Structure formats: C-alpha cells, structure tokens
Amino acid sequence: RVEYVKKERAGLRLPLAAWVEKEAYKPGEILAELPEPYLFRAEEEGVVELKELEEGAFLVLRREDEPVATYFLPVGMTPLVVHGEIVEKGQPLAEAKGLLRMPRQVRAAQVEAEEEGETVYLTLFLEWTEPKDYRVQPHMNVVVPEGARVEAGDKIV
Amino acid sequence: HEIGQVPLLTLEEEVELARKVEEGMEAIKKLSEITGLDPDLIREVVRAKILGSARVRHIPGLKETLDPKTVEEIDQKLKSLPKEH
RNA sequence: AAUU
DNA sequence: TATAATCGAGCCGGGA
DNA sequence: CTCCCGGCAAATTGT
Numbered sequence: 559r560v561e562y563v564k565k566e567r568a569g570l571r572l573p574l575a576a577w578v579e580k581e582a583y584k585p586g587e588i589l590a591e592l593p594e595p596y597l598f599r600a601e602e603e604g605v606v607e608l609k610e611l612e613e614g615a616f617l618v619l620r621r622e623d624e625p626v627a628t629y630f631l632p633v634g635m636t637p638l639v640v641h642g643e644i645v646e647k648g649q650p651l652a653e654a655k656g657l658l659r660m661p662r663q664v665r666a667a668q669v670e671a672e673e674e675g676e677t678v679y680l681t682l683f684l685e686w687t688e689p690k691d692y693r694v695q696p697h698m699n700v701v702v703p704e705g706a707r708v709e710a711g712d713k714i715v
Numbered sequence: 716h717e718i719g720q721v722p723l724l725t726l727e728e729e730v731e732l733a734r735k736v737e738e739g740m741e742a743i744k745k746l747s748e749i750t751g752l753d754p755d756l757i758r759e760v761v762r763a764k765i766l767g768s769a770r771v772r773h774i775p776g777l778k779e780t781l782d783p784k785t786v787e788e789i790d791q792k793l794k795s796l797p798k799e800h
Numbered sequence: 801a802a803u804u
Numbered sequence: 805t806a807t808a809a810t811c812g813a814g815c816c817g818g819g820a
Numbered sequence: 821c822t823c824c825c826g827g828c829a830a831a832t833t834g835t
Contacts, residue, residue: 696726696727696730697730699730699731699734716811717811718810718811719811723810724810801833801834801835802832802833802834803831803832803833804830804831804832814828815828816826816827816828817825817826817827818824818825818826818827819823819824819825819826820822820823820824
C-alpha cells in the first residue's frame, strides 16, 4: 500500500460566528461549531468531480476540463451532490450539521481567511495522503523497504 | 534424517533463491570487468567466505594456490571498491 | 558329498 | 537441457 | 548381568 503525498489548496465558506480562528488545524481539531445546520453552496457553475477520503471529502467544479473551483468538506459535512453532477452558482453542495472537524487522516497547514457579509471563506493549504493497493504475485519481489520515500518513476516491485 | 532437517521451499522462496543466484552470478561477472580478476577466482573467493573457514583448498582450473593469504588479499581488494562497485 |  | 515431480527397504568363552 | 567378538581336527576327491 503506497500512501501518496498530495499538497493542494482548496476553499470553504462558513458563517462567521460559527468558525474557530486558527492558523492551522491538526487532524481531528474542531474547525467550527454550527448552532443550526448550514448549507455550503456553490460559488461557481460546473460539473462535479467528487473525491471522497476515508473521512472528509474534496469537491471540484470544472467547465471544459479546466477546474474552476476546489472545495474541501471536513467531517460533519455530508455531500448533497454525486460525481458528475451539474451545478449552478448558489446551489447547496453539502450540509454541515453540529461540530465539524478536520478528518483524522488530513491536515491544514496555513489558513488565509476573507470576510464577506456574515460569512468567512477559508483558503486552505492542505496536505494529505491517498492510499493505493498493489497485489504482489509470487514471481515478483518488492525492492523497497517499509517506510521508504519514493518519487514518480521509482520502482516498488 | 539429515535431509529432513532442511524444509522444502515455497514457490516464493524457490524464486527468491533462484533469483538471488542469477543476480549473484551477474555480480561476479561485473566484478570481473571492474577489477580485471578471473571470474572463477572471484567466485571461489566469494564462495570461500560464505562457507566459512571450514573449507579452504586449492581449486584446479585456478592458476593461484587458494589459501587464506590470497583470499584475504583478494577479498580486501574487492572491499577496496567504491560504494557503487 | 565322498575316502581314511 | 524446462509440465511436475521433494525421507529406503549355532553353541561357547571371555572381556568392557 | 548383557552383549559383542573370537574360536570351533587333518589330508583327499568330486560336478
């Protein structure tokens, strides 16, 4: 199983009274607490690329094949859209209910925040690992040790 | 009774050993190129250290008498190689 | 197996 | 030189 | 005690 390192930048919008101010979020850390359920809505029109992690999700809107927006749904936020769904500006992507926190496997390094009306839009610099499994057949040998660091092109088996 | 003390190989284990042997012969071939030493002489020196001090004797085809003096010299010349060699 |  | 084969089939005295 | 090894007549012939 290779856990691949992905470092990206994805946005989120929350009420302002409901979010806890921090410069970074450790995994599991409480991100915001919502008095009542909140609907996180699309700020762009596009087709939905849904990427679900163990807990938490990534959501990506694209016109043509060029991504126009990257959203992050932490834990406590249930996607209301399915992969390949057409959305218009303003339609709810996910409902956020109660306490929402960073997922157990994914972090938040630097956090920039802009304030508009009664909401904050977080620009998040996120780092996480995506697992991929490989089956090793009897005539194959693994040439790499447990915990090794590999770049693109390095031989594993 | 003595043979029954060596367990039979798994399909994986069989391939690993067979693989290591092929790769090992190839290593001896390269060590010949790098060093300019007879492939058999290198092979006998490698083999000498694996089997241990127990077996050290003159080998026919080889031009040199194979004794701890020569096996230390030749092994020490092999250990005088750069890390990648 | 014989002979003494 | 290449399917795979993996554990056999007479009585007697004397000395350690 | 038990076992393990050493002994156990000569010459001759014959298929």
